[PDB]
Design a binder for this molecule. Structure first.
Ligand SMILES: N[C@@H](CC(=O)N1CCN(C(c2ccc(F)cc2)c2ccc(F)cc2)CC1)C(=O)N1Cc2ccccc2C1
Ligand SMILES: N[C@@H](CC(=O)N1CCN(C(c2ccc(F)cc2)c2ccc(F)cc2)CC1)C(=O)N1Cc2ccccc2C1
Lengths: 808, 805
């Protein structure tokens, strides 16, 4: 007997093992100042209790985290956020209490942020003066009833700010205390589907747009001072309703949600302007709804989702990213303000203001990305003033790179009075030039809050990328004038998450590795101004510094001739010759890479606990995995739960050969979300390989998941019958084991993303087919698991399931 | 040692095939009809419901001079909707009756015209029965109404007419002409909180009332026809969301569910009148309300338990209950007391002044208790002959055991000024109150048990436990002379009987522990001058019939109270061996599991447990039914606290008497109240019960309804000790830290005991760091209807005991 057996602990024993195991700066703002301190870094951070507004003093060495707010409890009673704010917190996966974000205006020193019920503000820097003690944070009153969501200061005038209240755009004035509503879409459950300024469910969940309104950066002076706001109008009437249990479990009630199924209708959408004029006293004189001369649905037919939007820096154009329903055709459009006429009741009136719109004014479709895989929504779009602009683009080569583009704004001339339906490419601009600023078998980061910082003086664009290796994020500088020598600025051996000064003199880097915890360091760009590309990142100061054996990154190749990366958590105190029981950790879906060179000890602590007890833990980024360019991701197209398991097994057999200690007779597939889907999919296809499976929040019916995600990867149901049925674990329950203790199902009862239905439908089908199952519900938890108590029970149940049942 | 019996360990495949091997409705709802032919071969025709598939309308012939043929009334016909799926109001009415049988569950019948009316298919149907021989096509009744037509009833005064609820309003129609008139206007969910003719949730779930209107038996001469009905308003009653059966649709349904301590609905009695002419057309209609408001006349009344009319049509009647369910009264309501309802207070006051001073509410009977009022069906008004009112009434409160009393109350007209509003706080004098039955036993009056009163012979036939609590028997006693009670059904068996209107025959659905049921038709024969002593002679039979019956036993407790039990022996027992034991439990009020009737249909899984060598013990402890109010009252305000002692007491007695109980391997298990006591067993007696498999448990009494919880446990404001003491969710710290000791089973669609109870239990288990196993039933409410689920339920149960006991 050369097989290693784990110590079988009692339940109190396992509880103490988990309890024993469990016993950073972000959102930076560089403001320059002559005393000892050159800059001030404002930021959000959580010291050794809750997240809050902090600052450090950059001198001329570890920086102190100075408190900016005075004895301020930003989090509510216990931590009970409002119904909308906690869903806003689930969409961003914000699992920290306190001030999650803040708006800032660098000229005035105005900070604006949510906390408890109301909004708050405090003034610091510039014309007010720098505090050297915690400031009293001032409340802003309202006579709006409910919560005030999505605060943003007016860029053109710091006296004004905006917010959503009851699904409508509001505008207020900090100084005078005045409020004014601008949209009137919302008056009710089904009875009020109308909404303005909001990003609807799918847009938040699947497209990562959490706002639906955009201030104009500049103010015009017609004929008073006018301030415009671009905003998405939304109409969720024909979108199917679904009921999900309230966290008020004692109430025994649910919430209506406009949840689009794959195939079913997405909300009807439009962009609208909201103007308003002000005087010297700062009072709102007049307000106006404006809409597009022709309807949004006819100017841009076959457009389903507004991915992104904003303005140009001059305010001469609003813009948006448009997507088609299959998400294979993206467009960038300029919408000039003169194309918007005041929304009016009368047929006689609506043509008068239409006639008044110039023939020269039109929508100019600047850029258009096309593919056979799918469009990923890349954030990067920097228009220069006058059209020249920087854009990220993956479709062209198959890898996300920066291009510089010049578009020709030639006015064809249009009869805006008489009703107009366009041809195929009616608005496409001539692309004058398109320069490849970056190129290669690697990617520029443009999603999940990655961004470029463009310095106009030097003609350099700063960006993050995988140029050295997929395992590491790094900061790179390149010229957009001359696409030439890219210079790496972050030191190798680590993965960096950086943020730049607006002056381009300092920068912060939050960085880590597999073997080392995270650090947050401030680096000064030094070197003469003769050649600005090649300024050395001089280490200036440190914000943060620094049982557990870390895992080892490794790599292998397939019979199809391609690199897949993996990770191994080595069994603690390993004897060569002994073979250990193996927990294969899984996710395997798109938008995720688990195998990279960064510290895993915080989020994936349980994997090291597993390791501490004797388990081999293996992670494999198979085809579909993120960071490897479009074709690598595209391997899943209309075949989810098919390609993934075969390279999960390939990575496990490889691990058996490279390392000495795997027992392939005792392997356990486990993952949450997509991982749970794959766990269930592993036990269907490879029961010979996987003795047990712990599947958590799986999708069992693809039909029951939404438009945005599903249709991007698996097409519409009517177009992909085979793939929907092949990849839906609930329709293949006949192929789950007849042996009990081989499948443990986990699901959150409040899960608003992947609904409990999937499990409820899997069990329904398991019972029908006559199949044993174990199940664990989390009654107070949604897609993730926030409450510690719940988390501990999960981990204790995990160790007990593997202990008793992953055997022989 | 080798004394411990170890059950054969089977694979999950093995268990499924054992369970599959296990599984491999009787006549009811009788109607006697005399043939009216002196020279013909048949004396009677029995009409009834039954199976071969679907529960369809059948009939048998009773010859004058032996199995009877089950003749079908309908021409093939399909009563069940395709794939066996009913609408909302049909399915949630079947759950309240626990109707788990396909097809026609009930019919109305009119014995003058031979007119049958029944809710079949997704509509209404009718047929007439000269007397047919071969089947007939039942005619579908047309309608322009949108939704389901619920609660169909023939108008007793005129078989041309009938009624139904439609969108929670009362409608009247005519099977001859086809004309349809709506009578009430309460409705157009949440937005529509009013309703008329409808029995609300708690009225159905906890009070055994399903109809909310009552035809007047006579018509007064055009001719007019009255209908009594409960007008109801659920605005102030809390709303809760329960998952629809359309799981694929992922929507809940809103119920009006009054949790304990919350408001019940505002209620009232109202009349609905409509005149007709010689050609059958409805001429006019009229809403009518009580001349004084309902809440001022009969204050402190919370639930309308039962209602109807006297046979003459003179007085309507109702049984009223107070919120703590300790005070019941039977009120007479003459039609005179109700006036045309109008918004014009001057037009209404013209009607108010018009109602005479003599007309009045007469509170006839009244029942006071310090335990609780159980709602009993039996109330028979005799016809008023020779200002006063004689009637028969069942009454548990007087002695503590339910017995028939003949009562005469004085209806002395007081005199009231109905025009000017007043507020009292009607009590009739009782002229006499004779006990017709007495003793330490009981007359059956809940759950559709009834008397049959023959006025020609002055006798009252009834169902009771006079001989033994283990058997229901048919008795006859005179109501003139409270004398000799003669038994008509033979001992050894429990019986479910039903009488002829001419009192010459009866059917008896009867059975025993040892023997499967039979439905036998008997004839009452003997001299007519001595009617009490008719010998019941066997006339004919309509039905006859791996199993091993249990044996009933009794033991006494430390307090000297006699508790009955059942035990299933392990099959092919070897004296010496000590077997692992499954204590099957219910333990709540309103149920008796231990009696002398067949168990093998409903409780086959207990024999299946026995077939694999498990001991199965069942004990009816204090709080259980059929033994009078004292015995039930042992629970009052102490649920979860008394029950397990008797259960453990019966379990120790069982290990003594029978030599085969290994007390080291006892598993407690039950559904509903049973699963609650299973959890309470694992908390209070963990040394005694190694595992608990608890199904559909109430884990927070504070979350269960008004009707049930308040009756036994009081309002939470008055009993915070007992609520907390008996809520298993608050005592989770005391549950085991060892895994494999607690399996939780619950129906996801449960609209009675909500899945919340399980949900909230797991929450508290997770907080305490306690292990559990769980199984959901996605397409199941409180009971497990679907075969596949039940099989899965049984395979889990066996595997769980096998692995972990
Ligand atoms: N719409 C997607 C979204 C998705 O697939 N993702 C996982 C979450 N993820 C963020 C994250 C949040 C919280 C946390 F703890 C970790 C990651 C993230 C990732 C990288 C990063 F830098 C910052 C945040 C983004 C990608 C979905 O909900 N499902 C769940 C699910 C379940 C079954 C089948 C398909 C899908 C598809
Ligand atoms: N309101 C009570 C009502 C009750 O206690 N009863 C159950 C229904 N029962 C009928 C029945 C039908 C079919 C079947 F399969 C089982 C029972 C029955 C029994 C005998 C008979 F002749 C005719 C019908 C009558 C009594 C309740 O449900 N809970 C559920 C529950 C669960 C936990 C705690 C308290 C309670 C309170």
């Amino acid at each position: 007997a050369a097989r290693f057996q784990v110590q079988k602990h009692s339940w109190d024993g396992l509880r103490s093992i988990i309890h024993g195991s469990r016993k950073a700066p972000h959102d930076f703002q560089f403001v320059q100042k002559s005393g000892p301190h050159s800059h001030r870094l404002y930021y959000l951070g959580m010291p050794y209790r809750e997240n809050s507004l902090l600052y450090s003093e950059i001198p001329k060495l570890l920086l102190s985290w100075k408190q900016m707010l005075d004895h301020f409890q930003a989090t509510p009673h216990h931590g009970v956020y409002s119904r909308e704010e906690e869903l806003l917190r689930e969409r961003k996966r914000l699992g920290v209490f306190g001030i999650t974000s803040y708006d800032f205006h660098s000229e005035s020193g105005l900070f604006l942020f949510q906390a408890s019920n109301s909004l708050f503000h405090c003034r610091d820097g510039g014309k007010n003066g720098f505090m050297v003690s915690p400031m009293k944070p001032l409340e802003i009153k309202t006579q709006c009833s409910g919560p005030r969501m999505d605060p943003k200061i007016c860029p053109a005038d710091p006296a004004f700010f905006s917010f959503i209240n009851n699904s409508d755009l509001w505008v207020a004035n900090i100084e005078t205390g005045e409020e004014r509503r601008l949209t009137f879409c919302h008056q009710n459950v089904l009875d009020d589907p109308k909404s303005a300024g909001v990003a609807t469910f799918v847009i938040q969940e699947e497209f990562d747009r959490f706002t639906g309104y955009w201030w104009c950066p500049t103010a015009s002076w017609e004929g008073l001072k006018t301030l415009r706001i671009l905003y998405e109008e939304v109409d969720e009437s024909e979108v199917e309703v679904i009921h999900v249990p309230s966290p008020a479990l004692e109430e025994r009630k649910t919430d209506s949600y406009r949840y689009p199924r794959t195939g079913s209708k997405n909300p009807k959408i439009a962009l609208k302007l909201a103007e308003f004029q002000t005087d010297s006293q700062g009072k709102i004189v007049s307000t106006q709804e404006k809409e597009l001369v022709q309807p949004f649905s006819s100017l841009f037919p076959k457009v389903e989702y507004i991915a992104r939007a904003g303005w140009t820096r001059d305010g001469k154009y609003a813009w948006a990213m448009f997507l088609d329903r299959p998400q294979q055709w993206l467009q960038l459009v300029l919408l000039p303000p003169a194309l918007f006429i005041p929304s009016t009741e009368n047929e006689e009136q609506r043509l008068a203001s239409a006639r008044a719109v110039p023939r020269n004014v039109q929508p100019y479709v600047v850029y258009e990305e096309v593919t056979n895989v799918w469009i990923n929504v890349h954030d990067i779009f920097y228009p220069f003033p006058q059209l020249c602009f920087l854009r990220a683009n993956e479709c062209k080569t198959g890898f996300c790179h920066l291009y510089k583009v010049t578009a020709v704004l030639k006015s064809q001339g249009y009869d805006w009075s008489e009703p107009f339906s366009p041809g195929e490419d009616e608005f496409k601009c001539p692309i004058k030039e398109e320069i490849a600023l970056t190129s290669g078998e690697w990617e520029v980061l443009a999603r999940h809050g990655s961004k470029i910082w463009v310095n106009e003086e030097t003609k350099l664009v700063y960006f993050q990328g995988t140029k050295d290796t997929p395992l590491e994020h790094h900061l790179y500088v390149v010229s957009y004038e001359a696409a030439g020598e890219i210079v790496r600025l972050t030191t190798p051996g680590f993965s960096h998450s950086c943020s730049m000064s607006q002056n381009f003199d300092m920068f912060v880097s939050h960085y880590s590795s597999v073997s080392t915890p995270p650090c947050v360091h401030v680096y000064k760009l030094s070197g003469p101004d003769d050649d600005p590309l090649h300024k050395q990142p001089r280490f200036w100061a440190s914000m943060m510094e620094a049982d557990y054996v870390p895992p080892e990154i490794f790599h292998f190749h397939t019979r199809s001739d391609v690199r897949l990366y993996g990770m191994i958590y080595k069994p603690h105190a390993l004897q060569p010759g002994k073979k250990h029981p193996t927990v294969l950790f899984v996710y395997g879906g798109p938008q995720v890479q688990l195998v990279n060179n960064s510290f895993k000890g915080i989020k994936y602590l349980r994997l090291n606990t597993l390791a501490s007890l004797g388990y081999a833990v293996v992670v494999i980024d198979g085809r579909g995995s993120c960071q490897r360019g479009l074709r690598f991701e595209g391997a899943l197209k209309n075949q989810m739960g098919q390609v993934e398991i075969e390279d999960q097994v390939e990575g496990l057999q490889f691990v058996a050969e490279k390392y000495g200690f795997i027992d392939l007779s005792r392997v356990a597939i486990h993952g949450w979300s997509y991982g749970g889907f794959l766990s269930l999919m592993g036990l269907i296809h490879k029961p010979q390989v996987f003795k047990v499976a712990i599947a958590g929040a799986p999708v069992t019916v693809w039909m029951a998941y939404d438009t945005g995600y599903t249709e991007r990867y698996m097409d519409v149901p009517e177009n992909n019958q085979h793939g929907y049925e092949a990849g839906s674990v609930a329709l293949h329950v006949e192929k789950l084991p007849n042996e009990p203790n081989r499948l443990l199902i986990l699901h959150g009862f409040l899960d608003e993303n992947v609904h409990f239905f999937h499990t409820n439908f899997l069990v329904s089908q398991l019972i029908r087919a006559g199949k044993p199952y174990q199940l664990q519900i989390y009654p107070n938890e949604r897609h993730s698991i926030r409450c510690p108590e719940s988390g501990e029970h999960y981990e204790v149940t995990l160790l007990h399931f593997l202990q008793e049942y992953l055997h022989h």
